[PDB]
């Protein structure tokens, strides 16, 4: 009888690595979509187009505008909520959206507790390692009415990790 520690990915950014555990047991579709886009190089070259100190940093848009991106299936998909998955700590990873069931590819990472998002945005991950990298991202000189970082900071490429207990 073996154990499966599940899948996780490491975001290789211009300012460091961020390792994210992906809750594939709870949010299956969100999990497969994230892993698939990650493997297709979809996020390679993506910048964090909106960084709000104390709130969250958002990315996942190839176009870099703020209204781009889509799912591996090429069509927005349903939300996946769980009463045990909440924006209660610094480092939760969730899917941005424009209302119920409009999940595509954009996602964000919280800089702290953000209870008003619970049950409104699908949380599918958590930063397990590389918290340092999050601090660098937060204290980044940004615009002021757009929060667009002054200097572009990208996600160079992504490493997918398999079951740690294989």
């Amino acid at each position: 009888s073996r154990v499966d520690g599940g899948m996780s990915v490491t975001l290789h950014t211009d300012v460091g690595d961020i390792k994210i555990e992906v809750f594939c047991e709870r949010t299956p579709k969100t999990c497969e979509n994230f892993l698939a886009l990650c493997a297709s190089n979809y996020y390679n070259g993506c910048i964090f187009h909106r960084n709000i100190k104390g709130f969250m940093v958002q990315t996942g848009d190839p176009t870099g505008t703020g209204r781009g991106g889509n799912s591996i299936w090429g069509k927005k998909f349903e939300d996946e909520y769980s009463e045990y998955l909440k924006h209660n700590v610094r480092g939760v990873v969730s899917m941005a959206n424009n209302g119920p069931n409009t999940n595509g590819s954009q996602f964000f990472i919280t800089y702290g507790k953000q209870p008003h998002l619970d049950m409104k945005y699908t949380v599918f991950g958590k930063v397990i390692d590389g918290l340092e990298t999050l601090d660098e991202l937060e204290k980044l000189p940004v615009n002021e009415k757009t929060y667009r970082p002054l200097n572009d900071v990208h996600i160079k490429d992504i490493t997918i990790h398999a079951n740690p207990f294989a």
Binding site: Q106, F108, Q114
Partner: peptide
């Protein structure tokens, strides 16, 4: 306010 949308950014 503090929302995470994709396109129409609101307050």
């Amino acid at each position: 306010x503090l929302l995470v949308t994709a396109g129409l950014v609101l307050a």
